[PDB]
Amino acid sequence: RPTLPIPDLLTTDARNRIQLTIGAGQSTFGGKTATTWGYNGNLLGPAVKLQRGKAVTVDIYNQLTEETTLHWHGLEVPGEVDGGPQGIIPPGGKRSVTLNVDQPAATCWFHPHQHGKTGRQVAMGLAGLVVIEDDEILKLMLPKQWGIDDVPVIVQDKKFSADGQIDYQLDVMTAAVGWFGDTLLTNGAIYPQHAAPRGWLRLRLLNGCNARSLNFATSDNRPLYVIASDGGLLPEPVKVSELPVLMGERFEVLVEVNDNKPFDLVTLPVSQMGMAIAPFDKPHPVMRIQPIAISASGALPDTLSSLPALPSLEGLTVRKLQLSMDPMLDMMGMQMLMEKYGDQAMAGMDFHHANKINGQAFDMNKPMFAAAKGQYERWVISGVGDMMLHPFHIHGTQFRILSENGKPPAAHRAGWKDTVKVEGNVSEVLVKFNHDAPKEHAYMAHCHLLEHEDTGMMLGFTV
Ligand SMILES: [Cu+2]
Ligand SMILES: [Cu+2]
Helix, strand or coil, X not given: CCECCCCCEECCCCCCEEEEEEEEEEEEECCEEEEEEEECXXXXXXXXXXXXXXXXXXXXXXXXXXXXXXXXXCCCCCHHHCCCCXXXXXXXXXXXXXXXXXXXXXEEEEECCCCCCHHHHHHCCCCEEEEEECHHHHHCCCCCCECCCEEEEEEEEECECCCCCECCCCCHHHHHHCCCCCEEEECCECCCEEEEEEEEEEEEEEECCCCCCEEEEECCCCCEEEEEECCEEEEEEEEECCEEECCCCEEEEEEXXXXXXXXXXXXXXXXXXXXXXCCCCCCEEEEEEEEEEEECCCCCCCCCCCCCCCCCCCCCEEEEEEEEECHHHHHXXXXXXXXXXXXXXXXXXXXXXXXXXXXXXXXXXXXXXXXXXXXXXXXXXXXXXXXXXXXXXXXXXXXXXXXXXXXXXXXXXXXCECEEEECCCEEEEEECCCCCCCHHHCEEEEECCHHHHHCCCEEEEEC
């Protein structure tokens, strides 16, 4: 097996700048070359390291021949540097943004947000990571040797055409059910191995798929200890035997590594339309962990952090976000899926403006509301009316889930989150925006099933 690629961990130069170049190159998948896109390389991107209470400037060079944007998913930053679809970087141009980091330690990520084309640009290869640190987390003595016992694991599917190229299409089927493929990549590699020292291994898991939900576990049933969600540490580790991860979500987990017993991180079949087609009808390897008989120094602390109490609900502004899909797209897309794949597509289970929030397909020129700054709001997001999976993401914040798709959140999902599951039911989150976003650089709130976002299931909002 190839070794797990390790994204470079980037820090500022003396001018306090980090350089990101966006460009096209070549990757190989099963001995077949394919045009891919990457940040500082051919595919995926580096890990940008940030520190709470410090500012950094990122210089972003677009060397593609088409427009793109660079969005810092999970970052509490003003709209002007949020890199939403208004954050255009012209082909051959450069944009610089200053990130004033003011949130706890967490693993966030970054990716394009080009209007109507986010799914294609992610599918072509663009994604990177953000490692935020603070004073608190370093005192815990978690595993912390990047690329050895502290490793990012960005899991993504693709499909390829006969000629080896990435086979991306935004069409009536994928506008309904998402773009998904038959090949699983782990930091861009197919089923790599990672050599890890005896003791605890920390995995920073990212579901970077356009539309596929994942569910991590280990091949020999050793548990995973969840220590962090999208927005940072949980109050204490939560032991799980499986870990569902929606598109765009991150979790950090510790897993034990013992001498002489390799094991695989796997993903288990999920109950989402289209996603259990072989080989995803069975547990599927993500990577092999190869134990090395050197003692690892990291610890699994009994306590990690303090999560604040949930504030009173009475008197808060309620915002209702009703997701919907045009009944015609939904039917025609689901029909195409069933025709292509048959009953297995439900195992366990103009279109360009057909997906909507509050009866409107995304309108860049018109933010749907002004949210308040520095005050908690209760946002109620509903997917009643269809059966698709909508991981709903809100920019500019880390929120608390009050209700996730009609039930209190699981303990490892009860901390800081920037994504909440909406599927045929209703979720409620408690959200606060600490930063401004004017109409020219508004925040987005959208489904992170990218083909839904690109065909309308997004709104802009100001703060
Ligand atoms: Cu985001
Ligand atoms: Cu959706």
